Amino acid sequence: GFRKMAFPSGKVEGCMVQVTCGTTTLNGLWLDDTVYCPRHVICTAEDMLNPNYEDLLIRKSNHSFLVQAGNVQLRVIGHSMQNCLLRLKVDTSNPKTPKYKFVRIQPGQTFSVLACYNGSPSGVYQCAMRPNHTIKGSFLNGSCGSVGFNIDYDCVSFCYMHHMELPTGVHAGTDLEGKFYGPFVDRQTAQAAGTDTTITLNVLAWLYAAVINGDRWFLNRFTTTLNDFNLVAMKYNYEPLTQDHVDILGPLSAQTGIAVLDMCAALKELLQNGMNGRTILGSTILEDEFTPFDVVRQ
Amino acid sequence: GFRKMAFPSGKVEGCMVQVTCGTTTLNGLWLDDTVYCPRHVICTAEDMLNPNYEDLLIRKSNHSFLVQAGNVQLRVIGHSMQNCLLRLKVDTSNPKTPKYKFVRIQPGQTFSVLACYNGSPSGVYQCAMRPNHTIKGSFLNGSCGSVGFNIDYDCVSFCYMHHMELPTGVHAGTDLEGKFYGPFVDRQTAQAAGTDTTITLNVLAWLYAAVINGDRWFLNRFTTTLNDFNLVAMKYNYEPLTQDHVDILGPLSAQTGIAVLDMCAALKELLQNGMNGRTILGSTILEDEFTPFDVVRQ
C-alpha cells in the first residue's frame, strides 16, 4: 500500500571503507582525504569501560591504522580525535566523494541507514531519531560505524554514525562530528535511555497519509482544542503538540481538507477506543516514523 | 530490532536510464550495450486498447528511441523485441554494468525495488512476490520500468521489471526476459488479480521471530501432522506447507527448540480462534513478507 522507503544508498556506498586497529574492525566513512570512524576502534578488548581515549590515542601512530577501500589499502598519513570519532587523514582523496554536509538531526526526524559489515554494505532501511535520542534500529555483528543520512538533490546530509547497542536492544550513536545523541558514552558500562514517547507530529502526518490513499474510516465530525488534545496526549505517552507543529501540518491539512485539530480529534478517538481490529494505511499500530516531509515526498 | 531491509541499491542505480518514445517516457535498465524497458513505451493512448506490438514496432526506427543516461544522450544502434520487453542496442557500453544474472523468483520470495521516476532513482524498498503473482508495491506515475533485484556476493540477480497497476492497487510485471508474472497482459483489459493467499512459510517464520523476541502466548501443546495442518490452512486461504518449507524452518526450529509441526499447531489455533485482542510483535495481523532468511539475520 504505502511503504517506508530508504534513499538510494549509492552515493554513500562508495564512501564505505574498513578501518582496523590492532585486532578490532569496524566501518569508516571516506570523504575527500579523511576517514571517519568510531574511536572505539583503538580499544583492545581489555580497554572496554576503563578506557581513557586520549591515553590510548597518544600511544598509536598512523601505521597502527589499516584502511581498506574494498581491496586497495590507503596510506594513513595523519590522525586526530574529535569527540567520539577518529579523523584519519589518508594520502588519496575518494573520487566517489559526493556533495555532502554534516547535520545533527532533531528528534522526530527520519533518515536512511546503510548497514555495513567490515566496509561492505549489506542492507538499507529507514528509521527515526526517537525522542529519547536512541534509534530502534537493526545493527548486527560488525555494524559499528555505519552511517545514517538523508539526500536532497545531489547532496548527502550525513546525520548519524552508529556506535553501540543499549541493554534494551536499541541503538546509540553520534553525529558526524562525534557528539553522541542523548546521554550516552562509548564505554562498556550499562546505560539507560530516557523513557521514550510517541512522535505525535508523525502520527498525525501518517493519519493524513491514509486520508490521501482513501483511508477515511477513522475520521469523525468532532474536534478538540490544542490543550484539550494535549491532555489526552500526556495520558497516552505522546509528545505534546506544539503550536508550530500545527503549522508544519498546515499544507497537509489543506491538501486533505481536514483542519489539524479535527485530525487530532480523530487521533484522540483512535487512542481511547483502540482500532477495533481495523487497519490504517495497512498497519494495526499508530505509526510514528513518517514525517510530514516524508509524507509529501512519498 | 526486526525491520524490512532492502539491499544496497547503488549497483543498480548506475544502470538506470530514461527511455523516451513519442509523448511517453519510462525507465530502462542499461547492462553492457543493451537497454531493457517495457515494450509499452511505443504505445500511445490512441494505440493502447488492444495494441499489436509487432505492427507498432515495425513502424519504429532506431532514431525513434531517445535514451538518456543522466546528462549523456545514448543513440540506439538496434532494437528487437523479447516478450513484453524491448532490447535496444546502444553505441556506448555501460562502464557501471556490474556482475549480474537474470532470475525468475518464486512466489513467497522477496526482493528489493528501486523506484525511479524518469531515469532518476527515488527510493528503495523490500517486498515479496505474492502467491497470485502480484506485488503489494509502491509505484506512482513515472515508475514504469523500475526493477526489482537481490544481491548475492557482488552479483545482482535481476528479477522484476515493473509494468502496470491492477484495479486492486497491486502491481504486475515481468522478469528480465519479458515474461509476465502470473496471467497478466500489457493490454488495457478487465484483468484483476486472483484471490491472494497468505505465505504460510513466512508467517511461521514471523512466529519464530516473535518467540525469539519475547512473546510466546500463542504456543500450545497440541500436535499436528503436516497433512491435517495443510487442510486447515487451505480453508483459511493460507498456502499449504510443503516438505521443503519444513526443512527451511530447520534453523529457526532447534534454535527455539519448538519443532516445526508444533509451530504449525500454534498457527492452526490462531487461524481457528483468532486473537481476541492479543498482539504479536506489536500487531494483530500475521506478517507474511518476512522470510526464514530474514529472521536468521537477527
Ligand SMILES: CC(C)=CC[C@@H](O)C1=CC(=O)c2c(O)ccc(O)c2C1=O
Ligand atoms: C555491550 C557492552 C556493555 C557495550 C560495549 C561498548 O563498549 C561498545 C562495543 C562496541 O562493539 C563498539 C563498537 O563496535 C563501535 C563503537 C563503540 O563505541 C562500541 C562500544 O562503545
